């Protein structure tokens, strides 16, 4: 159980935990493109280290690592790497996504010689590869510890190209699913403009929803979120199968994640266009993929002038940041995550515990006006205590930091007795 009443910020006291991990921050170096996944007491982590600019610097090293999350005796979660792999030519590795299964994390990445496929989509030749890493490696064990696989069979249906697109996925039995995106020629995308909700939106036009399904109104492709399915039962050379997301509350394909919470799958999709309110919910079906999106009115994301925070009117825009949240209580539908408390700038990270229509308690992770970008939150039980670990890109240069936050089981003893009685 958790505190279900609105409470002041002091009930949450986050701590930094990345000092035990090789996130070796120094001047003249930037650590970028991060991922975090946490599963069954283990974790996966990745970043790209560049010498110089985060943007234009020479790529030094891409690490893809796994480890364990454990209580060392001081009743907090600590992270230690157990197994790390570095691919050759780190500038070619993009959009990695990690999924845990039994002995391993399986990490699926795109290979690119033309930069980010999203912004170079008509030039990117689809090419994917997978690295499997044991979380508890053992001496002299063949390919148990590290096993590389380049994919060469992908079933994509009507999509021209598909790609992993989000930090982490899920297993169901012995089938793995990675958040993903498909590139569909715009001329083949059909959308009834009557599905575009423009009532009480004086400046919106009915065409805006369909135009904003690609990164610009005349883009060659539209983008559609989904999953890449990897069924270990088939054996041999991997066949990945793309599963498109259903068209309820359809927005441009964007980085997403699927995760298990309290026994059932949950989905988050970043809001990269005009529907700026947070998109998450329980998964109704995995294949075909359909999410029961929350009608959440309190969590949004910073945008730009056309689609700023809390905007709900259709516009042609490609704007926003990935700031996920993790369901921690299904009965009351309470989630935890880090949002950016700012309207048209990526600033002011705030860790919050929230229902659809109310933030229960929240705390700034830094000072007013601190730049921050991607945030990735995963929660779990440590003994009988709920903890969340949040990776936050935060800003002398922006860097991934990992925070740990204990979620309170009650608000205070007197409030607990008042409401419960007995």
């Amino acid at each position, epitope marked *: 159980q958790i505190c279900l009443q609105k409470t002041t910020s002091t009930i949450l*006291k986050p701590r*930094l935990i990345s*000092y*035990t991990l090789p996130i070796n921050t120094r001047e003249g170096v930037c650590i970028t493109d991060p991922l975090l996944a946490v599963d069954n007491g283990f974790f996966a982590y990745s970043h790209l280290e560049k010498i110089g600019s985060c943007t234009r610097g020479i790529a030094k090293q891409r690490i893809i690592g796994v480890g364990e999350v454990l209580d060392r005796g001081d*009743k*907090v979660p*600590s992270m230690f790497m157990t197994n790390v792999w570095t691919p050759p030519n780190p500038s070619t590795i993009h959009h990695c996504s990690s999924t845990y299964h039994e002995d391993f994390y399986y990490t699926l990445c795109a290979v690119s010689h033309v930069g980010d496929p999203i912004l170079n989509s008509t030039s990117w030749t689809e090419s994917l590869s997978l690295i499997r890493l044991a979380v508890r490696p053992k001496s002299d064990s063949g390919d148990y510890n590290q096993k590389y696989i380049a994919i060469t069979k992908v079933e994509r249906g009507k999509y021209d190209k598909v790609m992993p697109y989000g930090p982490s996925g899920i297993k169901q039995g012995d089938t793995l699913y990675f958040p993903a995106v498909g590139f569909l020629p715009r001329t083949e995308f059909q959308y009834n403009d009557s599905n575009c909700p423009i009532i009480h939106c004086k400046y919106s036009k009915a065409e805006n929803c369909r135009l904003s399904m690609g990164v610009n109104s005349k883009s060659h492709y539209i983008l559609r979120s989904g999953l890449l399915k990897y069924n270990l039962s088939l054996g041999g050379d991997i066949i990945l199968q793309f599963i498109e997301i259903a068209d309820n509350r359809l927005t441009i394909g964007s980085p997403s994640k699927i995760y298990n919470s309290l026994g059932q799958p949950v989905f988050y999709q970043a809001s990269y266009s005009w529907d700026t309110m947070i998109k998450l919910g329980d998964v109704d079906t995995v294949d075909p993929l359909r999410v029961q999106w929350r009608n959440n009115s309190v969590i949004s994301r910073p945008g730009q002038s056309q689609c700023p925070r809390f905007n709900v009117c259709p516009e042609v825009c490609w704007e926003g940041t990935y700031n996920d949240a993790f369901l921690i209580d299904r009965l009351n539908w309470v989630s935890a995550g880090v949002y950016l408390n700012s309207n048209q700038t990526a600033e002011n990270p705030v860790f919050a515990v929230f229902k659809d229509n109310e933030i229960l308690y929240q*705390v700034p992770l*830094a000072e007013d006006d601190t730049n921050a970008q991607k945030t990735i939150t995963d929660c779990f039980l440590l003994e009988n205590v709920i903890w969340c670990i949040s990776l936050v890109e935060i800003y002398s240069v922006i860097r991934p930091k990992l925070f740990a936050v204990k979620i309170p089981a009650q608000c205070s003893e007197s409030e607990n007795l008042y409401f419960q009685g007995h």
Partner: antibody
Amino acid sequence: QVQLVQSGAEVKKPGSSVKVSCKVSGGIFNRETINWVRQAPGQGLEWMGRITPIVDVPNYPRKFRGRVTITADKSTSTVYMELSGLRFEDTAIYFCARFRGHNYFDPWGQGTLVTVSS
Amino acid sequence: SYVLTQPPSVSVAPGQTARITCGGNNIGGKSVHWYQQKPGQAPVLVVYDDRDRPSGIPERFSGSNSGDTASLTISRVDAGDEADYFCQVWDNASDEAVFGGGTKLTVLG
């Protein structure tokens, strides 16, 4: 059951350097995070830096800049703090201390008195 | 750089209650830990996480934290409780430990 035992007191000329050791016993040396803290006469406690041997990359506050070098030896289960360019104001008791809960220090080494003098 | 502010000295009669304060901007949002140092030896952790006691610490030692002031309260003060008491936080913005200036507890009379 972790125990931290430091090397003995030393005296040094100004401009020279000193290297204090903290011998770690009774835990998993690779995963212990060892911090250094100093205490000058008539002043309080001052954090100087830390290291975790499995990561083996130290961090320091900018007050000390290039003067402090912290290292670790899995050979000996020992962390070392070296302070360069010694000044009269560096006369202090130097403590090592083990990070707990990602926030506090327990236990502490017994302390090493370093005097700088002509 | 976060700054903690302690009184330089506090004095009590034997058996009284001693109150050592530790001030900072919204310190009640940080975790506050307290160390007892005697003139010769190493600091000893007497309170952690605002208000928790480590094994082997007398219950007479208790801490609290709220608003802009955290405090260590020592009940039934003993002459052996004479020491310099340091409050400590971890400043997440600079990622370093911060100590208060210390409060010397004299047991008068």
